[PDB]
Design a protein around this ligand. Structure first.
Ligand SMILES: Nc1ncnc2c1ncn2[C@@H]1O[C@H](COP(=O)(O)OP(=O)(O)CP(=O)(O)O)[C@@H](O)[C@H]1O
Ligand SMILES: [Ca+2]
Ligand SMILES: [Ca+2]
Ligand SMILES: [Ca+2]
Ligand SMILES: [Ca+2]
Ligand SMILES: [Mg+2]
Ligand SMILES: [Mg+2]
Lengths: 994, 994
């Protein structure tokens, strides 16, 4: 099909030869599948094959080093004779460390996307359609939909393909197509054709586009185009871009990155200044131009050696790692930030029905009026069996099976349940079980009437597929549904207008069948039905009705109740304006009470514990629901939000009560109350907002469209896998598994990701500081050069490389989930931390000069012995008195440097073992806890010993192998770094906190 | 200059304005240096920058794998859907192992060349020239030579630059220019000009080319062109190629390489056959075309996994390593083969003077006749002091200084020493010491006459440079040297024809001054001089002369003696034909004995011990010399070839005696005698040849041109750094240091290089055999596939990679130099070794299937348990009776394979620790003896664990991580391999040999 919007409903039906009531024929479906293919887009597998790489080279930090590489390379072509080699290496020593991370990053990034792309591929999308195959609407894989068969869609649904609306089954049909037309607000639809054949999507008010969601109403329509031919299948990634952005934790880490950049840039040009008097030295001999370039090169080298190059990548790796960890737990992270944000979560507002509960409804109790004797009132309670949606169960009166049809009140009760109901039931031949089609609460009523079989219909001689709606169909034949006043949360009810079909009930007139929240309906009832008679509603009757609702509500089964009534004398079909659902409550008045039903909706098993763990991590869990406060509190006690016998008269409200409080008190009640009932979708959001006026990190968990607002308002929205699409769209994460627990685990990961980020910045700084206080302490005490360009670049590639990145793989502390959430305002780096940095950064920098000196001084069997004369080292050229006579060129020996460069590397590797935690002992948290860290160290070490024992290298690096004794001197001066930190930890642990 | 050959001697002198007697002026030299630069070629530093790499890819073996990579890559583009990844990896897994060696090889190769190129650069070449600067010929760095100054050259010398012969100072001047004209035989030169301006080098019989050596005679000439303008400086590597060849050990290893290639190629196509019935299996499902390609791929995989790819490189690395080790000991290896060959050395024929001794001559004793009273004869012995060439010492008679000039006989003795002498003395201002110019024996005589000062010449008022030849010059003024009958080893003497200058001695006639080996000269003496008188030679006089020669000869000082005589009435200058030196002995007849001189030439200090160590290694050391048998045996006792009081009457010969023996006895005496004296250069070679008729590996060590033949004939020639160029040219190695010991060390290295080669072939085969007996034992017992293509290629890259190459770095056994040399005929692989191979190769191959089965069977907490049912594994598809019911697809689990592939890798690494020796216990020779091997293992292991724990990998490699318990199962079945070999070693060690 094409330009389907231009033609009319008949033309479209005509064009495909289909009855909008029957649907395609199994044969037609077979053919169309061949003529149009499956309703699916080309597998958009993990792309960005090369882009990912180039992405690694974007941050400022990596740019700098990437620039230094060019400089070091230009100076290479301008370096002559005897050391051109040691010049062409420097750049590659910078380029390498950079490339080593570009891979770990692009690799982690790859695995992430895949795991996620694989979790989506899991549970296939379904669609509701009408086909000759069956009389009732059936479910099917969305990919099997073909242009032609009749499709049904309702509030909350994801439009499966481009549909030409044929009929609107409600007063209004609003749609959310921002994903296409870009317009945020939900647009209204109609069936009227749009004549302009070249009209824009925003003008086709009689079309529904694949990918958009139904914001309101219900509608039936004919599929115009599917697969790639869809309005959105064309604007696909293959023919349209997308969008990106940087996480908040990253916004704070880039602000910190540059902050370091500036500092580093200063303490570097400072070196170039504190050495202007050396441009004219024998070591250079050449002009001040040749002597400057050297110290200039040392500056850049110190820069590179200081810049935390792996920060921009370690963050990407931790995030990707988080994403991947969630996927392994069946959680789709629609936004990287999510994981981090969930760590600072203090409050988690969760929806009840469908979220904290399973939303597998089943009417197991119900009653109608028996006798009304003035002051005395009796009810006719019943019990129904069968917990699933299967139409297999018995109606019991006093524990004994009875013919529901026997009771008049029960016949009406079923008439209402069947008629004022927008859902249905469909048997899944494959799984061999009846699945619902529509809302569980409504479907529960559908199976109910199937069980009651009030008109004693032959059901034994029927198939699984036919037994599903049989009884229901029968009742649909007795009355004609003129129209329905769709359910709306302000009214808390739904209605349906009916006219008698034949002349059996014709002598009675039109009727309106209502059902909604007990409180609302029972109040708009002036009559209570008794059998087939009617009597006025009285105090005593109202009394009985509610008391039993209360009983069932807060009972052991915490039943979700629904009232049913009828408008014996509805308004004149004309006097009613379906313009706005606000006028409907009036039409549902002067009603006659019929009966009540109670269904069970078991809370999810994993929820109780999750709430406990949430408590341990000092995270609050508030329940928000449209349901009854009684049953709402009941379930709260059942899941652990409330103690079995805890007084909650002050920690539980109903939107009514809440609104009754003055503004200031509402806000206040939000940080006190843990349960809100009979609350509207605007109240959910508001509650979340109040919780945010206290600068807290709020999470929202829901499944319905009445959770859309809240899920958006929150910092992080988590939606149920089996929930509406409209809820998923407004969520940062999706529990495909529907496992509530995963939310907890998502917080731990968020907490660990932050911790690792710290341990990394802690390592890189407490180490790189020594690499500076080593260059200045020497230019202060007067000692000779301790390191050269290539030398620095090397310590960098070995201390700021993989060993640092592997820090992003550090396990969470043994108590990361037993400490309250971190304030969103808490500073990235605490004062005590900066101390930790200078404390270590100072020792390591001094532990290096003390090594270069040690050789010169206390060198036992070590050559070149002397004492304190090092300060005046360029003076043996003219004035060498005390000088024993040892070559006046011993102040340029590789022995000293190579003796320090090793302590440096070595001590830094030791410092890495201190980054396995922040306050935990290296004895409580063994170094072997992060195998990836060890392997990173061993590799780093090996890579160093290699630079010392492979003939060509030691020369290029102006180094000289160390004695099997001099090394022990390093393991002597470096190893103690563990203690300095181990002790500081004991302080922040036992002294400060704890 | 140019076309210098076309012009005459005068024209050439004219062209540069130089006197062939004076030489260039310090000023002229300064200018010419600027106008022509230094006599040197462009620094031909280590080249072959890229060629070295491509060289790694030449051998057959690496070619094969290089082919498999192409195949595996072609099949990659033709593999579809679900495992294209596991297909594109295979090739890179082959390419990697190849590249990993190409580097270790090209790297080792690089270091080698450099070390050598650096050892050559060490001691600068010198040249003999005449310059106004000084009256006597002086020494100078050859690079300072400029076209123009007069240069001198003599037998043994290396021509410093392109010289235009000006004057031949001998009857003949033969030159060796093969290096240029290519003609092997030594060509005769002349002074006659060659008119053809475009003549070829082979026609310029009046030129000497830089780079060639003087085969005979002496000559003075003018430098025509130097530096790059030389006839050889043009044909340089930059404008001309070179040559190569493969070592014998390599010729035997390539014969063995292909031998394996054929076998491997068979046991591979065999696999492809023993699996034709599987091309039609469910595992493939596809046609026999799809099923074949698989088993075809497994074949190639087994091939690659079997081929010893690192053999062609490990050999190159050991050799290069040898070369490098020798350089570190100041030994220039002019041929890689050398080091290996020196290991099989059984006999080392070494020259005495200059080789076993220092050749720093100094006349410290001398005598002339005192009185001849018929039957009584007395001598006038003297003693001279001063061991160096400095003209500082005293002549003592009865321990008291005397005026040599006092004795007439001593005046003649000095006349002769000064006149019949081709060498001179030159003072080196820099080193501040007198250096010889010419042969040490002759120069010894030069310093001698300086000491005697027979004409009492004012020497006190002279400079160091002038004091050098003063007295000598004076005597040169008394007689005119008409011509000289150059020394020739058949005669064992030298002669000079002189005429009186003025009319002081004119009333006597012409004279001939002879000096040579005592035996020869004394026999051609009919008169003995007494003072200025002459008396006939008698028995008694002959008796005294020789007895004292004997005394001095075999004395504590083992003095090298020389006789001096004169021909009072020489033949008529015309009656003499200088055509051939064979006619000279006649001219030196009817002589008058004058006196004898004895010089000391101290044996090198390091020689004695070296001979001992040579003995321990069961290597013989024979001394060959032209010198006197008495003093020859004397020195032999002194250095250890002979015991202080050992009877050698049967182990010492003189070329005369030797020739007296019948052929069969000469040959025999060669394997018995350890000392040959008064032997000619033809005898040296012959001796070496006889030693080779016994299929032994003979080494020749020399310094003179009389060693050229022998050094060539031998298997390996070793020349002294301070020896002639003609000797160096005919040598495979050069002891720049002159350290005799290095020869010993060169043998150890030769022995170790072979050993390592064995340990490598031993490892690669005893291991790769398991990788075959693992594939067949499974296709025999019926068990399921144990490995796949990518799986094999992996075991290869990790067991046949660096861990194998590092085997070329294995230290020598603790007794490699205490075992006799290996027979040249000994088979590369002994029978007992092939056993060792199958013994291990079998267990490892069976220890793999027993692991893949173990999981399937005795798997404790390990899943997929069963019993013996494995044989019938493709039958649960139709007939599964006893089958407990466990999935009929458990026979395709990764658990089993990944459980074996680990044992394989693991057990092979353990096998590497068995290759640290052949018979020594892993307890005597710790595994940590070869750090390079350990590091290779750790890397290999790490690289494996990585393929198991990095999510993407285990999938690509169809593997699945092992339990922290299943691994212990590997360390249980693999670790015992150490014992199998440890025990076999105990056998070949204690049982077999030992
Ligand atoms: N289709 C329908 N027709 C009539 N009444 C309905 C209805 N669906 C729900 N209701 C009633 O209206 C009250 C509120 O609906 P609302 O959607 O706000 O809350 P909820 O109880 O359905 C789900 P949650 O627990 O997720 O908030 C319900 O609790 C129920 O009693
Ligand atoms: Ca850095
Ligand atoms: Ca660092
Ligand atoms: Ca191999
Ligand atoms: Ca192997
Ligand atoms: Mg809900
Ligand atoms: Mg000699």
């Amino acid at each position: 099909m094409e330009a389907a919007h231009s033609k009319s409903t008949e033309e479209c039906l005509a064009y495909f030869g289909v009855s909008e009531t029957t649907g395609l024929t199994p044969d037609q479906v077979k053919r169309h599948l061949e003529k149009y293919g499956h309703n699916e887009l080309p597998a958009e597998e993990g792309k960005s094959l090369w882009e990912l790489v180039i992405e690694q080279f974007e941050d400022l930090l990596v740019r700098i080093l990437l620039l230094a590489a060019c400089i070091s390379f230009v100076l290479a072509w301008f370096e002559e004779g005897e050391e051109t080699i040691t010049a062409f290496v420097e750049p590659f020593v910078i380029l390498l460390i950079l490339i080593a991370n570009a891979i770990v990053g692009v690799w982690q990034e790859r695995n992430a996307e895949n795991a996620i792309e694989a979790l989506k591929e899991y549970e296939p999308e379904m669609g509701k359609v009408y086909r000759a195959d069956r009389k009732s609407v059936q479910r099917i894989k969305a990919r099997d939909i073909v242009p032609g068969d009749i499709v049904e869609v309702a509030v909350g649904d994801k439009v499966p393909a481009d549909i030409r609306i044929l009929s609107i089954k409600s007063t209004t049909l609003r749609v959310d197509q921002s994903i296409l037309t870009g317009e945020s607000v939900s647009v209204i639809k109609h069936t009227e054709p749009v004549p302009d054949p070249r009209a824009v999507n925003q003008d086709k008010k009689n079309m529904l586009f694949s990918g958009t969601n139904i914001a309101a109403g219900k509608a039936l329509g004919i599929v115009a185009t599917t697969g790639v031919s869809t309005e959105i299948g064309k604007i696909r990634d293959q023919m349209a871009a997308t969008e990106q952005d940087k996480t908040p934790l990253q916004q704070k880490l880039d602000e910190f990155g540059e902050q370091l950049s500036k500092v580093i840039s200063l303490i570097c040009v400072a070196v170039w200044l504190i050495n202007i008097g050396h441009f004219n030295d024998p070591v250079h001999g050449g002009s001040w131009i040749r002597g400057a370039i050297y110290y200039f090169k040392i500056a850049v080298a110190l820069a590179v050696a200081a810049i935390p190059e792996g920060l921009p990548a370690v963050i990407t790796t931790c995030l990707a790692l988080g994403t991947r960890r969630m996927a392994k737990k069946n959680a789709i992270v629609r936004s990287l930030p999510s994981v981090e944000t969930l760590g600072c979560t203090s409050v988690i507002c969760s929806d009840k029905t469908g979220t904290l509960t399973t939303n597998q409804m089943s009417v197991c109790k119900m009653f109608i009026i028996d006798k009304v004797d003035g002051d005395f009132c009796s009810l006719n309670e019943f019990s129904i069996t069968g917990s699933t949606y299967a139409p297999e169960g018995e109606v019991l009166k006093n524990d004994k099976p009875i013919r529901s049809g026997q009771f008049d009140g029960l016949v009406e009760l079923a008439t209402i349940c069947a008629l004022c109901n927008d859902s249905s039931l469909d048997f899944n031949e494959t799984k061999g079980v009846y699945e619902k089609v529509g809302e569980a609460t409504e479907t529960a009523l559908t199976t109910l009437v199937e069980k009651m079989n009030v008109f004693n219909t032959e059901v034994r001689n029927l198939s699984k597929v036919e037994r599903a709606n049989a009884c229901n169909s029968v009742i649909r034949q007795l009355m004609k549904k003129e129209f329905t006043l769709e359910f709306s949360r302000d009214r808390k009810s739904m209605s349906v207008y009916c006219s008698p079909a034949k002349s059996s009930r014709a002598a009675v007139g039109n009727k309106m069948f209502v059902k909604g929240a007990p409180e609302g309906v029972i109040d708009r009832c002036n009559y209570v039905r008794v059998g087939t008679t009617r009597v006025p509603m009285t105090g005593p009757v109202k009394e009985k009705i509610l008391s039993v609702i209360k009983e069932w509500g807060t009972g052991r089964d915490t039943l979700r109740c629904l009232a049913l009534a009828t408008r014996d004398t509805p308004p004149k079909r004309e006097e009613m304006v379906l313009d706005d659902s606000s006028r409907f409550m009036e039409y549902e008045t002067d009603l006659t009470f019929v009966g009540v039903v109670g269904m069970l909706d078991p809370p999810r098993k994993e929820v109780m514990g999750s709430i406990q763990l949430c408590r341990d991590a000092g995270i609050r869990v508030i329940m928000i629901t449209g349901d009854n406060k009684g049953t709402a509190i009941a379930i709260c006690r059942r899941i652990g939000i409330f103690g079995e016998n805890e007084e909650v008269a002050d920690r539980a409200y109903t939107g009514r009560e809440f609104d009754d409080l003055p503004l200031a008190e509402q806000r206040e009640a939000c940080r006190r109350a843990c349960c809100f009932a009979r609350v509207e979708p605007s109240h959910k959001s508001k509650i979340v907002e109040y919780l945010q006026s206290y600068d807290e990190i709020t999470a929202m968990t829901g499944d319905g469209v009445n959770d859309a607002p809240a899920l958006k308002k929150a910092e992080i929205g988590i939606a149920m896998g089996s929930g509406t699409a409209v809820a998923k769209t407004a969520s940062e994460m999706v529990l495909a598994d529907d496992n509530f627990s995963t939310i907890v685990a998502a917080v731990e990961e968020g907490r660990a990701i932050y911790n690792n980020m710290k341990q990394f910045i802690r390592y890189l700084i407490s180490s790189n500081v020594g690499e500076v206080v080593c260059i200045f302490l020497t230019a202060a005490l007067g000692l000779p050069e301790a390191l050269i360009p290539v030398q620095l670049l090397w310590v960098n590639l070995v201390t700021d490389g993989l060993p640092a990145t592997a820090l992003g793989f550090n396990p969470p502390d043994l108590d990361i989930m037993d400490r309250p959430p971190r304030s969103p305002k808490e500073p990235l780096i605490s004062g005590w931390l900066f101390f930790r940095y200078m404390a270590i950064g100072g020792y390591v920098g001094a532990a290096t000069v003390g090594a270069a000196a040690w050789w010169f001084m206390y060198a036992e069997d070590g050559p070149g012995v002397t004492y304190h004369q090092l300060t005046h080292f360029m003076q043996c050229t003219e004035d060498h008195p005390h000088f024993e006579g040892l070559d006046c060129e011993i102040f340029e020996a590789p022995e000293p440097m190579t003796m320090a460069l090793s302590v440096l590397v070595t001590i830094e590797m030791c410092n890495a073992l201190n980054s396995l935690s922040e306050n935990q002992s290296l004895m409580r948290m063994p170094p072997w806890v992060n195998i990836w860290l060890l392997g990173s160290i061993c590799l780093s070490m090996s890579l160093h010993f290699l630079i010392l024992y492979v003939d060509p290298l030691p020369m290029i690096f102006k180094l000289k192998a160390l004695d099997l004794t001099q090394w022990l001197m390093v393991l002597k001066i470096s190893l103690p770094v563990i203690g300095l930190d181990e002790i500081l930890k004991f302080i922040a642990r036992n002294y400060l906190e704890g």
